[PDB]
Amino acid sequence: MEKEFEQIDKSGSWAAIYQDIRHEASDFPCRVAKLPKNKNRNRYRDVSPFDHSRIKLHQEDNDYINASLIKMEEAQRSYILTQGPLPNTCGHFWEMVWEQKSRGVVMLNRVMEKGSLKCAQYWPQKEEKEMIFEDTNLKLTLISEDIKSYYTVRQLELENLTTQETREILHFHYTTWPDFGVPESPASFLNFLFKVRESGSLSPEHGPVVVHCSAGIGRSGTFCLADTCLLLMDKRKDPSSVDIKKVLLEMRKFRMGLIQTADQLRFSYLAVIEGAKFIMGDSSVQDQWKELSHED
């Protein structure tokens, strides 16, 4: 993988490699997403979930949400990638989390970036001001939060008002990942990814983790690609056989446009090459990543 990395860097062909992936990516219909009645349920007109992999809400009225199930068979992990909830789809968002039995939510964007809203404030910012989603009959409360320099982890209590049942949801919010950009370093990214892994949120005993950014494809795709490749390197007899370009094409069978720039693709290689050191037994990199990330 790093041999390929070196060659691409030397040739300066990242844009070409990336364009080839865009050209070869699957193109499946998004008929439901495009129905007139779903116009206000989509944040961006050019980012829709494929019908075959879309997550269906459990309701007779309208079961649509701009979200896709990415099921990576070999890696044995599923992720739900979705757009940043809109003011009218926050209830749908949490209904999906409840129905799919998700334990964690990974947010890679900020509500406002460079003066523009990119996502609705779908969770409570104050413990004393909980939220009620009347359309889906759910209540959400901020229990606590651990604020680090570039990411915050929150403990949320989600309650199904119909049954009084409650569940703890972990919110992993990466706050310094610019739009169409990359994390400050492979170290800061990996430190965060392993925080999510360590929480148990990605365990197969839970429903798929919900990952989102603004459109749910650029930053969200980078996060999932790196995680899946690391999973495969740890599982295969020979980790050097992991073809990140092939893994990305496989993921794009489930949702369009995953990885939005050639540099996010290059960053994925770097994150996986760096992350591989831990997978192969290096006991000092995890700690090194934390120091490098300056999370305190």
Ligand X SMILES: CN1CCOc2cc(S(=O)(=O)N[C@@H](Cc3ccc([C@@H]4CC(=O)NS4(=O)=O)cc3)c3nc4ccccc4[nH]3)ccc21
Query: Hey, which residues between 93 and 112 contact ligand X (CB under 6 A)?
Result: 109
Reference 155, options 174, 165, 140; nearest CA is: 140
Q: Per the annotation, does 286 bind a ligand? A: no
Q: Closest separation between CB of residue 260 and ligand X, Å?
A: 4
Cβ closer to ligand X: 22 or 101? Answer: 22
Q: Report helix, strand and coil shares of the chain as percent, to nearest 5.
A: 35, 20, 45
Question: Which residues lie below 8 Å from residue 147, measured CB to CB, with a gap of 6+?
Answer: none
Q: Closest separation between CB of residue 289 and ligand X, Å?
A: 22
Q: Check if the beta carbon of residue 70 is closer than 8 Å to that of residue 80.
A: yes
Is 215 near ligand X (CB under 6 A)? yes
Cβ closer to ligand X: 114 or 129? Answer: 114
100 vs 254: CA distance, rounded Å: 17
Q: Which residue in 30, 90, 119, 213 is the catalytic one?
A: 213
Q: Closest separation between CB of residue 268 and ligand X, Å?
A: 12
Compose the 227-266 pattern: x for residues touching ligand X by CB under 6 A, - for all others: ---------------------------------x------
Q: Per the annotation, does 201 bind a ligand? A: no
Q: Per the annotation, does 217 bind a ligand? A: yes
Q: Closest separation between CB of residue 134 and ligand X, Å?
A: 28
93 vs 66: CA distance, rounded Å: 9
Q: At what angle do helices 219-235 and 244-251 cross, to 10 degrees?
A: 120
* Both structure tokens of 277: 């050191």
Cβ closer to ligand X: 47 or 158? Answer: 47
Reference 189, options 109, 103, 290; nearest CA is: 290
What 3-state DSSP class applies to 249?
Answer: helix
Is 268 near ligand X (CB under 6 A)? no
Q: Per the annotation, does 216 bind a ligand? A: yes
Q: Closest separation between CB of residue 221 and ligand X, Å?
A: 7
Query: Hey, which residues between 10 and 39 contact ligand X (CB under 6 A)?
Result: none
Helices (H), 135-218: 186-198
192: phi then psi, degrees, rounded to nearest 5: -70, -50
Please confirm, yes or no, whether 119 is among the known catalytic residues: no
Is 68 near ligand X (CB under 6 A)? no
Cβ closer to ligand X: 87 or 178? Answer: 178
Is 179 near ligand X (CB under 6 A)? yes
Question: Which residues lie below 8 Å from residue 6, measured CB to CB, with a gap of 6+?
Answer: none
Cβ closer to ligand X: 102 or 260? Answer: 260
Reference 202, options 116, 99, 109, 76; nearest CA is: 76
- Candidates 40-48, 98-106, 139-147, 248-256 — which segment interacts with ligand X by CB under 6 A? 40-48
93 vs 83: CA distance, rounded Å: 10
Q: Per the annotation, does 276 bind a ligand? A: no
Which residue in the set 10, 12, 27, 46 belongs to the binding site for ligand X (CB under 6 A)? 46
Residues forming the site for ligand X (CB under 6 A): 44-47, 109, 179-180, 213-219, 260
Residues forming the active site = 213
- Indicate the annotated binding residues for substrate: 179, 213-219, 260
